[PDB]
Design an enzyme around this catalytic site. Structure first.
Site, PDB file in Angstrom:
ATOM      1  N   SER A 119       0.828  -1.332   0.147  1.00  0.00           N
ATOM      2  CA  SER A 119       0.165  -0.011   0.095  1.00  0.00           C
ATOM      3  C   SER A 119       0.829   1.357   0.179  1.00  0.00           C
ATOM      4  CB  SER A 119      -0.938  -0.105   1.185  1.00  0.00           C
ATOM      5  OG  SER A 119      -1.991   1.052   1.116  1.00  0.00           O
ATOM      6  N   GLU A 216     -10.218   1.302  -9.011  1.00  0.00           N
ATOM      7  CA  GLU A 216      -9.602  -0.041  -9.633  1.00  0.00           C
ATOM      8  C   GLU A 216      -9.228   0.471 -11.080  1.00  0.00           C
ATOM      9  OE1 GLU A 216     -12.049  -3.508  -9.918  1.00  0.00           O
ATOM     10  OE2 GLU A 216     -13.122  -2.903  -7.800  1.00  0.00           O
ATOM     11  N   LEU A 218      -8.394   3.319 -12.407  1.00  0.00           N
ATOM     12  CA  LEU A 218      -7.310   4.220 -12.223  1.00  0.00           C
ATOM     13  C   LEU A 218      -5.945   3.408 -11.904  1.00  0.00           C
ATOM     14  CD1 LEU A 218      -8.399   7.408  -9.980  1.00  0.00           C
ATOM     15  CD2 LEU A 218      -7.733   7.196 -12.404  1.00  0.00           C
ATOM     16  N   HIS A 248      -6.011  -7.101  -2.353  1.00  0.00           N
ATOM     17  CA  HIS A 248      -5.397  -5.930  -1.814  1.00  0.00           C
ATOM     18  C   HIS A 248      -5.387  -5.869  -0.390  1.00  0.00           C
ATOM     19  CE1 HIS A 248      -4.905  -1.794  -0.283  1.00  0.00           C
ATOM     20  NE2 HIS A 248      -4.404  -1.424  -1.367  1.00  0.00           N
TER      21      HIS A 248
END
Length: 270
Positions: A119, A216, A218, A248
């Protein structure tokens, strides 16, 4: 399991930084935390069997604690709004203060290590390797922000940081027009990754204020232009993992960390 908790002074931030540590070899995997990093334990230890998985890997494991929304970078100033009374200097800490401490006290080498982020810290890992290639010939970015300076990303990052402890992106790298955004943009720094011959491992899973499907799209778009640009720019030492089943989340980030163990052992210790 011989896991330790260390208190490593940071001159630049004027405080001690807690570090979870497991020995096992002179080279180390630096496991960087996500956006909502806590001050008691690193997310990898809260959520995954990372330490046990790398036990007797021939690699040490380092998990720094703290630095919510810090992007493991050196900020321009204290976060203005949430009352932060010092300036984040995590790039200084990870590349000078902590390695120095670990070498003197444990014999961990300051060179030839892996940076692994997810992340928030996925991009950080790549940027660390871009500017400190001797320290990090290996970097992994698991669901990271690969093009933080372009398009929607400065706005979305700024919103995420505000949602994660009230931190201010403007205090970090300035207005999106500031040189700091591009300096710390992994896509912009692809030529450094190529010149240093960094071994990079990039994971982008499916899944997940704006609709999920816009986000998503992007994310997919950015991850493909990074990949395309790496190859176009002469990159030949990357692994790009876009599995449809991948998500994720910590269970798949751990899946990727286990997947890359042999890759890291061979690059660092081979």
């Amino acid at each position: 399991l011989p896991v330790e908790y260390l208190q490593v002074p940071s001159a630049s931030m004027g405080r001690d930084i807690k570090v979870q540590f497991q020995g096992g070899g002179p080279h180390a995997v630096y496991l960087l935390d996500g956006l909502r990093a806590q001050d008691d334990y690193n997310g990898w230890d809260i959520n995954t069997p990372a330490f046990e998985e790398y036990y007797q890997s021939g690699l040490s494991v380092i998990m720094p604690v703290g630095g919510q929304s810090s992007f493991y970078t050196d900020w321009y100033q204290p976060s203005q709004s949430n009352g932060q009374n010092y300036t984040y200097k995590w790039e200084t800490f990870l590349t000078r203060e902590m390695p120095a401490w670990l070498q003197a006290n444990k014999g961990v080498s300051p060179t030839g290590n892996a940076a692994v982020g997810l992340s928030m810290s996925g991009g950080s890992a790549l940027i660390l390797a871009a500017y400190y290639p001797q320290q990090f010939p290996y970097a992994a970015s698991l669901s990271g922000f690969l093009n933080p300076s372009e398009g929607w990303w400065p706005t979305l990052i700024g919103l995420a940081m505000n949602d994660s402890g009230g931190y201010n992106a403007n205090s970090m790298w300035g207005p999106s027009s500031d040189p700091a955004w591009k300096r710390n943009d992994p896509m912009v720094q692809i030529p450094r990754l190529v010149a240093n011959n960094t071994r990079i491992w990039v994971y982008c899973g499916n899944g997940t204020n704006i609709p999920a499907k816009f986000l998503e799209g992007l994310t997919l778009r950015t991850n493909q232009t990074f990949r395309d640009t790496y190859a176009a720019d002469g990159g030949r030492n990357g692994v790009f993992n876009f599995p449809p089943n991948g998500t994720h989340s910590w269970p798949y980030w751990n899946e990727q960390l286990v997947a890359m163990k042999a890759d890291i052992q061979h690059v660092l210790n081979g």
